[PDB]
């Protein structure tokens, strides 16, 4: 049985970075060369493992996290990184073992006049824990005055929309990102490469 990497990478619709989508993968085989020899990926970086060795390793579970961010922010999808995305939306631990794959999605996720459907968290009290997914629309208290859940002065809605127009620079353009995580537990290994 082949692993359903198709439905993740070629998903017709991608999630916002604050509410990122996780696909749990197990009990299948995959040819990771179809990824790292793809001509459409603009970013392809792996941590803790060599992508050419992936075809000879077995893993307890694989996690495919997918979302959309700005081009200037793809560099934030890395261990030990600081920034609005890394701190409020999607954090990777220092011992992260996996790959980060990004590609330009201007032709899809940007509309004339603007595609304002992709969001990101701009305010938060504390930094995220690794692989945390916070989706609260709780009003952020930026003053010494209780907000009591009412938007106002020093009371901000925590989520900001992305302005994706096709005329923005490649930086401010939208990028679809997939983060593969390779989990090796002390149980039988069930995801592998071919033979």
């Amino acid at each position, epitope marked *: 049985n082949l692993c359903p990497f198709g439905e993740v990478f070629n998903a017709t619709r991608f999630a916002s970075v604050y509410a990122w989508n996780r696909k749990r993968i197990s009990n299948c085989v995959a040819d990771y060369s179809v*990824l*790292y*020899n*793809s*001509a*459409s*990926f*603009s*970013t*392809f*970086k*792996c*941590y*803790g*493992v*060599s*992508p*050419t*060795k992936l075809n000879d390793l077995c893993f307890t579970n694989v996690y495919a996290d997918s979302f959309v961010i700005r081009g200037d922010e793809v*560099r934030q999808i890395a261990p030990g990184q600081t920034g609005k995305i890394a701190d409020y939306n999607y954090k990777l631990p220092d011992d992260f073992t996996g790959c980060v794959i990004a590609w330009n999605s201007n032709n899809l996720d940007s509309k004339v006049g603007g595609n304002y459907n992709y969001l990101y968290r701009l305010f938060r009290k504390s930094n995220l824990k690794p692989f945390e997914r916070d989706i609260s629309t709780e009003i952020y208290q930026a003053g010494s005055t209780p907000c009591n859940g009412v938007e106002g002065f020093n009371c901000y809605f925590p989520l900001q929309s992305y302005g994706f127009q096709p005329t923005n620079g490649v930086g401010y353009q939208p990028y679809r990102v997939v983060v593969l995580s390779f989990e090796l537990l002390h149980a039988p290994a069930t995801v592998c490469g071919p033979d």
Partner: antibody, heavy 126, light 111 residues
Framework: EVQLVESGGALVQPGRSLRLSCAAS????????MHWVRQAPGKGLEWVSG????????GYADSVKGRFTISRDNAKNSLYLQVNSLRAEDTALYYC???????????????????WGQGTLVTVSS | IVMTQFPLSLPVTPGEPASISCRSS???????????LDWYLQKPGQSPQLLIY???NRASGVPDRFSGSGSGTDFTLKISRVEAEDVGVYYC????????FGQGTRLEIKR
């Protein structure tokens, strides 16, 4: 500006060793693979060795396997090439060569060898 | 993989186009449709620098006069208007496997 400054090339007797070093600046060193490409005087270009962004994968040319050893210190934005058991055909300029990919042996994200150092000259003579 | 360049030295009058050949032993066409061949220009007294990557793409700062073409085991670099600065040796390289280079082509300016 991207700047790859090589050093360590010297006159060395045959059979001895040398430690080539390459100090990098002007780009995120942690993000790219690194290569050593050499050129004999008046001759063509020869790939020597390459290393991933995190030393995860390493390659060597057949003429240098077992003798040369590539490494990198990502904290010091530096690349190294240990040349051992030296022979006359190792006499060449050794170019530090920046890769566009994080990994030297994958085809994705390839946009050519972005920048080349000016090289350091290694002469093997008695 | 073995790269071979036919014109080892190309004398060309200024303003007149130039053309360089590159044969290879194996096909550099890949499943993803790209031809993994590059062009590198080594100007006098300098190390080589990237000119063309992926057969038909210019590196940063490369004028519109430089173009690349080919597919499989046969490629060609072309210049529309040769200039005096274009002096140097042009090198083939394949990126499908570990990098192999061609013996260079010296570009002479027929003055």
């Amino acid at each position: 500006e991207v700047q790859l400054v090589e050093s360590g090339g010297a006159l060395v007797q045959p059979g001895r060793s040398l430690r080539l070093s390459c100090a990098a600046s002007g780009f995120t060193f942690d993000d790219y693979a690194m290569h050593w490409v050499r050129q004999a005087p008046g001759k063509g270009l020869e790939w020597v060795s390459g290393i991933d962004w995190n030393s995860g994968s390493i390659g060597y040319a057949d003429s240098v396997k077992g003798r040369f050893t590539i490494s990198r210190d990502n904290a010091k934005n530096s690349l190294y090439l240990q040349v051992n058991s030296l022979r006359a055909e190792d006499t060449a300029l050794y170019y530090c060569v920046k890769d566009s990919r994080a990994h030297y042996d994958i085809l994705a994200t390839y946009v050519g060898f972005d920048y080349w150092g000016q090289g350091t000259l290694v002469t093997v003579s008695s | 993989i073995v790269m071979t360049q036919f014109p080892l030295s190309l004398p060309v009058t200024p303003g007149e186009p130039a053309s360089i050949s590159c044969r290879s032993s194996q096909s550099l066409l890949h499943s993803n449709g790209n031809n993994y061949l590059d062009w590198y220009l080594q100007k006098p007294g300098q190390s080589p620098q990237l000119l063309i990557y992926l057969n038909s793409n210019r590196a940063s700062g490369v004028p519109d006069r430089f173009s690349g073409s080919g597919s499989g085991t046969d490629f060609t670099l072309k210049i529309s208007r040769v200039e005096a600065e274009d002096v140097g040796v042009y090198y083939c390289m394949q990126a499908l496997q570990t990098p192999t280079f061609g013996q260079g082509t010296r570009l002479e300016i027929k003055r």
